[PDB]
Amino acid sequence: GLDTAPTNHQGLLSWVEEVAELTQPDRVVFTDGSEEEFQRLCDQLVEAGTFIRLNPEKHKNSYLALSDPSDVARVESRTYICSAKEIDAGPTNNWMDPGEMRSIMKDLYRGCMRGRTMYVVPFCMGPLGAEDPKLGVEITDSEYVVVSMRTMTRMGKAALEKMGDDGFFVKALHSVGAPLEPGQKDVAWPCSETKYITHFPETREIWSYGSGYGGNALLGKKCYSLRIASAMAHDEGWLAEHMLILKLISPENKAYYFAAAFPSASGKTNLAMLQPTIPGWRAETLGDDIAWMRFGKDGLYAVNPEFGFFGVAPGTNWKSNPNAMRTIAAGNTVFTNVALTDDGDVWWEGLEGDPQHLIDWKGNDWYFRETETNAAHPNSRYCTPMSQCPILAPEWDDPQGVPISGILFGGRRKTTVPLVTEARDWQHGVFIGATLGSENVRRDPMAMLPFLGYNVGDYFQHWINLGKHADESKLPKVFFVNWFRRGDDGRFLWPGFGENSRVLKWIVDRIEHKAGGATTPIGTVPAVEDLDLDGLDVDAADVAAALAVDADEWRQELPLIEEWLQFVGEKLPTGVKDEFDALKERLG
Ligand SMILES: Nc1nc2c(ncn2[C@@H]2O[C@H](COP(=O)(O)OP(=O)(O)O)[C@@H](O)[C@H]2O)c(=O)[nH]1
Ligand SMILES: [Mn+2]
Numbered sequence: 001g002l003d004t005a006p007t008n009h010q011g012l013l014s015w016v017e018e019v020a021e022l023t024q025p026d027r028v029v030f031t032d033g034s035e036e037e038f039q040r041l042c043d044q045l046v047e048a049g050t051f052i053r054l055n056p057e058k059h060k061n062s063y064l065a066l067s068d069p070s071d072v073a074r075v076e077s078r079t080y081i082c083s084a085k086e087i088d089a090g091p092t093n094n095w096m097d098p099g100e101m102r103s104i105m106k107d108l109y110r111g112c113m114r115g116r117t118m119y120v121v122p123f124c125m126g127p128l129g130a131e132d133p134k135l136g137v138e139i140t141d142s143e144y145v146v147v148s149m150r151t152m153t154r155m156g157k158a159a160l161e162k163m164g165d166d167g168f169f170v171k172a173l174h175s176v177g178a179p180l181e182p183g184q185k186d187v188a189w190p191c192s193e194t195k196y197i198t199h200f201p202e203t204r205e206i207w208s209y210g211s212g213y214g215g216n217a218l219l220g221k222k223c224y225s226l227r228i229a230s231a232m233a234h235d236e237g238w239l240a241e242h243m244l245i246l247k248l249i250s251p252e253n254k255a256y257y258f259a260a261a262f263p264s265a266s267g268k269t270n271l272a273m274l275q276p277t278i279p280g281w282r283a284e285t286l287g288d289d290i291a292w293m294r295f296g297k298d299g300l301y302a303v304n305p306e307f308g309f310f311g312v313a314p315g316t317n318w319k320s321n322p323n324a325m326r327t328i329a330a331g332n333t334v335f336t337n338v339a340l341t342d343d344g345d346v347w348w349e350g351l352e353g354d355p356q357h358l359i360d361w362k363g364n365d366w367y368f369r370e371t372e373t374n375a376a377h378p379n380s381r382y383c384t385p386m387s388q389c390p391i392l393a394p395e396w397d398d399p400q401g402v403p404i405s406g407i408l409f410g411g412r413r414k415t416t417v418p419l420v421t422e423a424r425d426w427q428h429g430v431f432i433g434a435t436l437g438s439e440n441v442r443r444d445p446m447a448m449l450p451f452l453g454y455n456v457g458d459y460f461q462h463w464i465n466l467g468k469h470a471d472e473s474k475l476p477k478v479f480f481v482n483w484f485r486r487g488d489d490g491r492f493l494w495p496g497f498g499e500n501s502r503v504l505k506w507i508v509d510r511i512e513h514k515a516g517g518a519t520t521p522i523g524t525v526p527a528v529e530d531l532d533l534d535g536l537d538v539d540a541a542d543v544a545a546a547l548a549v550d551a552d553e554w555r556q557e558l559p560l561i562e563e564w565l566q567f568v569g570e571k572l573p574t575g576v577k578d579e580f581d582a583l584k585e586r587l588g
């Protein structure tokens, strides 16, 4: 195997040996994260048929990977929180007894890596200069994982040195579950029909088995950055959240940092890479998925734990998201389940042009106005370095983070929810987030329903407790947005996208005590007067509709919120109950 590994960390070496004895690889390979390693691994993946090297004229050092159509997303049905007691997973999570789960996976892992290299992948979440850098080591039988982890994390040498010879780290175990018999020819994308993605909150351990795709296998992405980190955050006094981190810059050259939690398909990526439509406003981004937030000597400071973008390809283009496009155009990018063009480039639905022929994500011939399937997979991916993004804010690699002025919650609601609402205080802010709905209407609290590492009720308690024990003057203000409200004809009342900068302007003004809003049953909501609609080609009546708080619609909302808070169960905080009662009192 390998006892020529660049580390004297005994606890790690013990663990690597123990795992290797169980899974039985051919060899063990510690990854360093160097450019050379990366090149060597891609070449091996090209030779295996897993990667196709894209035309070097068009893209620099970029690759297309096609997965088995069986292994194509996060599978929440097989994703588990195995805490000691079932209550500490809670009703939003799938639980199994820790002993029962260890019995199942230790059986599955026995001999699972026969005829494969076991890669040991050290990595760091957050910038490397931290007091407590949150480090991890992922073991995997998949080069795709290594290569992807290189981009999505600070991977290898640096992280391994930051670990020392003792010093804690997250033990993340992964295997594709497709062992080889001697002489047997492998497949391009090895996976299995048996899948498990398991989190051990108390020991900070992730065990994944069966998939090689995305957040099932890139264990930093969702398993570490939210599921373990939310448990870490609970115990340590901070927040691990499904939030973009936006830096908005006024015409006066003042920087306002925002954290915003939307469920996927509700607009994180677009807001994070906003191009303001008001003169003299510009925006930079620090992240479009995960925010790790802690109190400093005063306010709340956000960092992006990740080192890369794992973006959805379909729908991405020069009109929609030019900044995403430019990030990718610099190359160094692995595309997964997109289409291959006749000139050896990548294409996906939404992208510029109408290529008449393509080779689709299953390797088959695709044809314009004939082939009934999408050329690119509808959830296909691009994996690109953060540092290639032209609008990346300079503070991105600062371990101190950035002070958050505002936290935003929202989702897709055709009715009921106004364009923007400010919370009354913190506890109402927690309640707004806690009852976040999107479309019949699914509650996705803080956009964390699939990602909580512990009881949802205790998570809300945690959110309240941080406020209670802080200077309310220095806490961020909370806001609830809704880009997707619709009129009687069914069109969007608000055009959104870049024009959402106008809602953000109002949020900024409110922070500078320089704009107003009417007190309402659900919090403070602006009139059409209070928004910068200067230069906007929309009906004022449509904007008033968007900002309407109809008492009748909100009364019909109360039983949906009721059911939801009953579903949260016995750990529902009394703080959240009071806010439900208060909202009721105010609506009558
Ligand atoms: N109407 C409207 N649609 C939006 C807005 N922002 C994003 N979208 C759409 O919502 C979908 C999801 O956008 P995306 O930014 O990828 O959401 P994410 O999955 O959270 O990153 C896409 O189909 C977008 O075109 C908006 O402000 N208004
Ligand atoms: Mn997401």
Ligand SMILES: [Mn+2]
Pocket: 264, 268, 269, 288, 311, 312
């Ligand atoms: Mn996104």
